[PDB]
């Protein structure tokens, strides 16, 4: 028996008193028998606590089996052998046999996103992904501990990088070292030996706070004032949280109770229970509302809202993936998809989840609607809301599982979820000349992830810039861009000569999907028995069958992000893009001029994105070739993804011209099946493919016009008679629905067609009908534009007849 330390139980005691989480980081070999001791101290300081414990791992267990029948029969034959007495058990076996543990895989950590745990035991260190850490510690409760078991190798790496800045020899990853430096910053973490000694090399001193939530009694007073109707029963059921959350829930109840069309979009964090207040106000809607409701989250993603709606129903008055059919003991509410219920908007009540702004503007149009915007684009959503609904948009970001922790600060830091969207440059008038100058800097990611407060400030600015108004990426992309070997960045921030600091107008991300370097990394990663890190090289070499793109290197744009302040920010982004093309053609500090004056051997450079209007405009400023696509509309925004690249190497003429030609052939045939979005940018991308053929090919990749025999083989003489009939007479489908496909293919293949004929050819390439596309895009004079397009059809009749015979 030996007394341990004055800091490690006192941290637990003041943590469960002031409602703040704590971090134990155990090192050593016999590291399994020591966690029930910490569990008993955590329980003994506060019996009034959550009881369950998480034991997430990546691949395997420590020495135990998570199967009570397995360890029971194993210890039964141990008693039959006779090296262990009958009444005997060690405290780790007592822990796993008595307590309630959830053992989840690190790969399937998503199955516990809503429920609460009193302990979290992150088992392995070497794959600690920030999405998983941000999922765990947001659910660990306020008097809670999180425990992390380390290695001999990771203990050596901590002893190495706990002097100043050093690193380990023999992909390399720096997010683990950023986490170790984050816990060196936090005083709510402590490293503990196998013999319960304490390492004061991270959070050394801690005291016993004095012997003892004024807002919680205020929440009780709010509940009592609401109490002393069915709204009071719902409010006393609802307010299980901060009084600001109670205020938002009661205000939503009183907003959609007697009224009938406002639209309120409340924004909450991962805490504060946005779906909780929504599900508890659903019963207030079901009592003092219509008998029909409209739910608009994604499919099988609102089980928490279903749980809160069922708890509200139970509290007031009750009785190909899931079972989501509604119930009734007295009305209907069902979780609809994207905006196909524009005909079924006879319901008065509607609510939606976080973010497509156009799809959220479409379905929520003629009824009383709310939204719940999560933190985990909302500024543009609220701006399009204010520019259009008695806006009672109010939700709170008070902490629900704690008051606020230094471990919560370390969660925000090591998950890089803190942002400050002030400009803080020299000037915008000094940044426009910086866009004219276009002097870029390299990343030097090892020193960038080496966290000093200057380095954390630069990484904070670049991280909020890159995550600001993106296509909804995540901490997996954060850990990837922090520890991918075939990756870098570029930022041309300040042109002026002020003091220490700066800004970041536009960051970019390149991904060297190479030949030599990717061959080296693939042969290295096969020894590590993992690895698949080449997307743009693998998609085009299988789609368009490119021996040339297989034998060359490649650079794929992982992301590019600037401000959303004005068009000048995207102008600076285009200038940084041209500066990157100039850079590819033409410890240590966390910036580089030598690597900004150095480059690699890459075969092509370009980016893939969804087929968007503004992204297509950026692709046109880019004008790099928009190659062959995939028609698959991603289920988030319904957009199809395509890759536009430029051949920036010695001889990319044959590869660029051939891929652009095959893409231009394939886009007309794919422009009817699953790509019929809008005529303007699609025909502009067809002209982009034509200008790509002009830039990359001169006289080799050139087909001639269709011959006399080809024009006599495609149509017939009956086509010429029906063409003269449509010329001198009406133009119904009796003679223009035989030859329309040949006319569209010959018109976009082979002497010139104007804007109205090109819009008619766009409708006929999307295979649409008469008054739909013409009176949707141009939206005037359907019959007059149709007769002018029929005059163009008579011109095409004379064209084919005079070309052939």
């Amino acid at each position: 028996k030996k007394a341990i330390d004055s800091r490690i139980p006192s941290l637990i005691r003041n943590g469960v008193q002031t409602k703040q989480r704590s971090i134990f980081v155990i090192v050593g070999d016999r590291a399994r028998n020591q966690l029930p001791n910490l569990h008993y101290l955590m329980m003994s300081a506060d019996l009034k606590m959550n009881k369950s414990v998480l034991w997430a791992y990546k691949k395997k267990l420590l020495g135990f089996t998570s199967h009570r029948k397995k360890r029971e029969n194993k210890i039964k034959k141990e008693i039959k052998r006779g090296t262990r007495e009958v009444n005997e058990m060690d405290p780790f076996e007592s822990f796993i046999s008595n307590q309630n543990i959830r053992y989840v895989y690190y790969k399937e950590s998503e199955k516990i996103l809503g429920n609460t745990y009193g302990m979290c035991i992150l088992q392995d260190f070497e794959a600690l992904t920030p999405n998983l850490l941000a999922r765990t510690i947001e659910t660990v409760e306020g008097g809670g501990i999180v425990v992390i078991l380390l290695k001999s190798m990771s203990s050596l790496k901590q002893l190495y990088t706990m002097t100043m800045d050093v690193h380990a020899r023999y992909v390399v990853a720096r997010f683990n070292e950023r986490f170790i430096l984050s816990l060196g910053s936090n005083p709510n973490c402590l490293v503990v030996d196998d013999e319960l000694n304490v390492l004061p090399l991270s959070g050394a001193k801690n005291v016993k706070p004095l012997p003892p939530d004024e807002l919680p009694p205020k929440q009780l007073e709010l509940q009592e004032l609401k109490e002393s109707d069915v709204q009071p029963a719902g409010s006393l059921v609802s307010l299980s949280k901060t009084v600001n959350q109670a205020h938002a829930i009661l205000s939503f109840i009183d907003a959609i109770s007697e009224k009938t069309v406002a639209l309120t979009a409340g924004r909450g964090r991962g805490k504060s229970a946005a779906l909780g207040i929504s599900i508890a106000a659903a019963v207030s809607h079901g009592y003092s509302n219509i008998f029909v409701t409209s739910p608009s989250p994604e499919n099988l993603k609102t089980l928490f809202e279903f749980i809160f709606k069922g708890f509200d129903a139970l509290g007031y008055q009750e009785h190909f993936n899931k079972a989501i059919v509604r119930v009734d003991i007295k009305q209907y509410i069902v979780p609809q998809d994207h905006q196909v219920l524009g005909q079924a908007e006879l319901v008065v009540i509607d609510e939606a989840a976080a973010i497509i702004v156009k799809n959220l503007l479409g379905p929520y149009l003629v009824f009383m609607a709310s939204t719940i915007n999560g933190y985990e684009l909302s500024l543009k959503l609220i701006q399009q809301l204010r520019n259009q609904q008695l806006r009672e948009i109010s939700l709170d970001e008070p902490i629900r599982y704690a008051p606020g922790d230094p471990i919560e600060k370390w969660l925000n830091k090591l998950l890089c979820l803190d942002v400050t969207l002030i400009k803080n440059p020299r000037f915008a008038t000094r940044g426009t000349p910086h866009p004219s100058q276009c002097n870029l800097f390299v990343v030097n990611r090892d020193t960038l992830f080496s966290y000093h407060p200057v380095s954390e400030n630069f990484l904070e600015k670049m991280m909020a810039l890159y995550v600001s108004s993106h296509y909804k990426n995540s901490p997996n992309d954060l850990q990837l861009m922090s520890d991918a070997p075939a990756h870098k960045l570029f930022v041309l921030l300040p042109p002026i000569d002020p003091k220490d600091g700066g800004r970041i107008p536009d960051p970019l991300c390149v991904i060297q999907i190479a030949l030599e370097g990717e061959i080296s990394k693939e042969s290295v990663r096969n020894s590590l028995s993992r690895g698949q890190r080449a997307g743009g090289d693998l998609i085009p070499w299988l789609i368009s069958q490119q021996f040339q793109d297989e034998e060359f290197a490649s650079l794929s744009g992982a992301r590019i992000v600037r401000i959303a302040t004005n068009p000048e920010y995207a102008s600076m982004g285009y200038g940084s893009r041209a500066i990157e093309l100039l850079r590819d053609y033409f410890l240590l500090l966390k910036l580089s001029e030598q690597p900004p004056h150095y480059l690699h051997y890459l075969g092509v450079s370009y980016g893939l994105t969804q087929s968007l209007h503004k992204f297509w405009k950026n692709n046109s400023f880019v004008p790099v070739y928009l190659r062959q696509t995939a028609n698959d509309l991603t289920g988030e925004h319904t957009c199809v993804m395509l890759n536009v690249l430029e051949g920036r190497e010695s001889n990319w003429l044959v590869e660029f011209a051939k891929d652009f030609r095959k893409r231009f052939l394939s886009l007309l045939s794919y422009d009817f099946h699953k790509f019929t979005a809008v005529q303007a940018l699609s025909v502009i991308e067809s002209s982009k493919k034509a200008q790509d053929l002009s830039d990359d090919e001169k006289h080799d990749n050139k087909e001639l016009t269709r011959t006399h025999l080809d024009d006599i083989f495609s149509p017939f003489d009956l086509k010429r008679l029906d063409s003269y009939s449509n010329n001198l007479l009406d133009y119904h489908v009796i003679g223009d629905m035989i030859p329309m496909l040949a006319l569209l293919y010959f018109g976009d293949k082979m002497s010139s067609v104007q804007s109205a004929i090109l819009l008619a050819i766009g409708l006929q390439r999307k295979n649409i009908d008469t008054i739909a596309k013409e009176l949707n895009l141009p939206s005037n004079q359907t019959i007059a534009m149709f007769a002018k397009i029929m005059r163009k059809m008579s011109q095409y009749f004379r064209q084919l007849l005079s070309q052939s015979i």
Partner: protein, 112 residues
């Protein structure tokens, strides 16, 4: 998924945790005994042909050779009712078991 690949005449074998499902999508609805090409599955193993032999999916259940139906089915073996996964490899495997017989253009350092 995972690929447990074995070369017979030297007597060696190695596993890869292979991410990026679009390379593994070549294997869908391709039953036991069917030969595959290295092109759609890798760029670093091209010229590599494999004969699959099923493999344990999640819940550790085998694939008994030559029946049907990439789901789970209950049948009789050595004569009791036991559940197996079918013949055809499906989307939710753990490991596919491969035998390499023709070497390709990029040499291996654990198998070869």
């Amino acid at each position: 998924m995972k690929l447990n690949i074995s070369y017979p005449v030297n007597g060696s074998q190695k596993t890869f945790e292979i991410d990026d499902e679009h390379r593994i999508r070549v294997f869908f609805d391709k039953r036991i005994g069917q030969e595959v090409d290295g092109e759609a599955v890798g760029d670093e193993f091209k010229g590599y042909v494999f004969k699959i032999s099923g493999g344990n999916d999640k819940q550790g259940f085998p694939m008994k050779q030559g029946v049907l139906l990439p789901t789970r089915i209950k049948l009789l073996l050595t004569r009791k009712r036991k559940s197996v996964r079918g013949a055809i490899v499906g989307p939710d495997l753990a490991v596919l078991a491969l035998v390499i017989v023709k070497k390709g253009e990029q040499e291996l350092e654990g198998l070869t």
